[PDB]
Design an enzyme around this catalytic site. Structure first.
Site, short mmCIF file in Angstrom:
data_model
loop_
_atom_site.label_atom_id
_atom_site.label_comp_id
_atom_site.label_asym_id
_atom_site.label_seq_id
_atom_site.Cartn_x
_atom_site.Cartn_y
_atom_site.Cartn_z
N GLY A 30 0.77 -1.24 0.00
CA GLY A 30 0.00 0.00 0.00
C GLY A 30 0.81 1.29 0.00
O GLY A 30 0.78 2.04 0.97
N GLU A 51 0.04 -1.54 -4.96
CA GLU A 51 -1.10 -0.70 -4.62
C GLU A 51 -2.35 -1.12 -5.42
O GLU A 51 -2.37 -1.11 -6.64
CB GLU A 51 -0.75 0.77 -4.89
CG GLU A 51 -1.88 1.75 -4.67
CD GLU A 51 -2.52 1.62 -3.30
OE1 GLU A 51 -1.82 1.80 -2.29
OE2 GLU A 51 -3.73 1.34 -3.25
N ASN A 93 2.38 0.42 5.63
CA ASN A 93 1.47 1.14 6.50
C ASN A 93 0.15 0.62 5.95
O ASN A 93 -0.37 1.11 4.96
CB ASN A 93 1.61 2.64 6.34
CG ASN A 93 0.51 3.40 7.04
OD1 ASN A 93 0.06 2.99 8.11
ND2 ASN A 93 0.09 4.51 6.45
N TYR A 96 -6.51 -1.11 8.58
CA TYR A 96 -6.94 -1.92 9.72
C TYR A 96 -7.94 -3.02 9.39
O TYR A 96 -7.90 -4.11 9.98
CB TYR A 96 -7.53 -1.02 10.81
CG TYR A 96 -8.05 -1.80 12.00
CD1 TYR A 96 -7.22 -2.70 12.68
CD2 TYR A 96 -9.37 -1.67 12.43
CE1 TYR A 96 -7.69 -3.43 13.78
CE2 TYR A 96 -9.86 -2.40 13.53
CZ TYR A 96 -9.01 -3.28 14.19
OH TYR A 96 -9.48 -4.00 15.27
N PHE A 155 -1.37 10.73 10.94
CA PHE A 155 -2.26 10.22 9.90
C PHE A 155 -3.31 11.23 9.46
O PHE A 155 -3.63 12.19 10.17
CB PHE A 155 -3.05 9.00 10.41
CG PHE A 155 -2.22 7.79 10.68
CD1 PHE A 155 -1.99 6.86 9.67
CD2 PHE A 155 -1.73 7.54 11.96
CE1 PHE A 155 -1.29 5.70 9.94
CE2 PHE A 155 -1.03 6.38 12.24
CZ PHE A 155 -0.80 5.46 11.23
C1 LIG Z 1 -3.13 3.35 5.57
S1 LIG Z 1 -2.89 3.52 3.78
C2 LIG Z 1 -1.09 3.78 3.56
C3 LIG Z 1 -0.73 4.83 2.48
C4 LIG Z 1 0.77 5.13 2.30
N1 LIG Z 1 1.64 3.99 2.57
C5 LIG Z 1 1.06 6.34 3.20
O1 LIG Z 1 1.44 6.11 4.37
O2 LIG Z 1 0.92 7.48 2.70
C6 LIG Z 1 -3.27 1.93 3.01
C7 LIG Z 1 -2.84 1.82 1.55
O3 LIG Z 1 -2.91 0.47 1.05
C8 LIG Z 1 -3.77 0.40 -0.07
N2 LIG Z 1 -4.50 -0.87 0.03
C9 LIG Z 1 -5.61 -1.23 0.70
N3 LIG Z 1 -5.96 -2.51 0.53
C10 LIG Z 1 -5.00 -3.05 -0.32
C11 LIG Z 1 -4.72 -4.27 -0.92
N4 LIG Z 1 -5.50 -5.36 -0.72
N5 LIG Z 1 -3.63 -4.42 -1.74
C12 LIG Z 1 -2.82 -3.37 -1.97
N6 LIG Z 1 -3.02 -2.15 -1.43
C13 LIG Z 1 -4.09 -2.01 -0.62
C14 LIG Z 1 -4.63 1.67 0.02
O4 LIG Z 1 -5.07 1.96 -1.30
C15 LIG Z 1 -3.61 2.67 0.54
O5 LIG Z 1 -2.78 3.34 -0.39
#
Ligand SMILES: C[S@@+](CC[C@H](N)C(=O)[O-])C[C@H]1O[C@@H](n2cnc3c(N)ncnc32)[C@H](O)[C@@H]1O
Length: 236
Positions: A30, A51, A93, A96, A155
């Site tokens: 992500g 992503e 990151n 949840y 966050f």
């Molecule tokens: C809490 S955010 C973290 C964003 C980034 N790492 C930051 O800190 O700016 C969760 C990230 O994971 C992605 N995400 C959610 N479910 C996912 C999945 N099954 N596979 C890949 N990415 C996913 C979301 O689109 C998002 O960009």
């Protein structure tokens, strides 16, 4: 849902506890808008960002415009197939709502030797809780460490609770592939206190004294390992 940590000041502090070197290949879970991704490429050998959001992959690629040692794949982490003959580490990151699925996926269906995650404070506390089945299944494959606290203000949108930066290091499995089934069964019955189904009143007694377990609300993974071993001995 999609929280971002975008303050460079705060990212540097978090990177301070993340010891990854120039020669490590990294898979980031992500990458979001690419804030951590940018520090990772400048820090590590190569970075495969995964992503699921097609838009975010673009933003990420844009942020890393001036770098060449990366790759942004628009895929679902849960479905992704990690390398099988390679040394790599993982950083992420993560959301949840799928923490559990993601952590099982990268611990049991990945061979990364070192894994760095930012997850919710409470979720982290339960990974080290030997009363929970998830913790027990993971501790047989990795050592868990809570490295520090990540304030919710870091966050955005600002979540209701704080999060933690945890590290997971792979080790020689404590459970043989042969005991796959047994361990799984034993784990479930123990977290549910269905002791009778796994021990006789005495086996249970002796096993605890043998394990050194004096308090059932506070057993170390080592002691639990002992229980599973006495359990094996009592049954063939
Ligand atoms: C809490 S955010 C973290 C964003 C980034 N790492 C930051 O800190 O700016 C969760 C990230 O994971 C992605 N995400 C959610 N479910 C996912 C999945 N099954 N596979 C890949 N990415 C996913 C979301 O689109 C998002 O960009």
């Amino acid at each position: 849902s999609q929280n971002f940590i975008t303050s460079k000041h705060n990212i540097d502090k978090i990177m301070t506890n993340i010891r990854l070197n120039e020669h490590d290949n990294i898979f980031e879970i992500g990458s979001g808008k690419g804030h951590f991704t940018l520090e990772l490429v400048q820090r590590c050998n190569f970075v495969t960002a995964i992503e699921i959001d097609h838009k975010l992959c673009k933003t990420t690629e844009n942020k890393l415009v001036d770098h060449d040692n990366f790759q942004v794949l628009n895929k679902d982490i849960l479905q992704f197939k990690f390398p099988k003959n390679q040394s790599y580490k993982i950083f992420g990151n993560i959301p949840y709502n799928i923490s559990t699925d993601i952590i099982r996926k990268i611990v049991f269906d990945s061979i990364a030797d070192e894994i760095y995650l930012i997850v919710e404070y409470g979720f982290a506390k339960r990974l080290l809780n030997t009363k929970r089945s998830l913790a027990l299944f993971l501790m047989a494959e990795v050592d868990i460490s809570i490295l520090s606290m990540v304030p919710r203000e870091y966050f955005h949108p600002k979540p209701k609770v704080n999060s933690s930066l945890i590290r997971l290091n792979r080790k020689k499995s404590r459970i043989s592939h042969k005991d796959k089934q047994k361990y799984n069964y034993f784990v479930m019955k123990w977290v549910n206190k269905e002791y009778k189904k796994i021990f006789t009143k005495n086996q249970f007694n002796n096993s605890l004294k043998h394990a050194g377990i004096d308090d059932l609300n506070n057993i170390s993974f080592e002691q639990f390992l002992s229980l599973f071993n006495s359990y094996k001995l009592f049954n063939k």
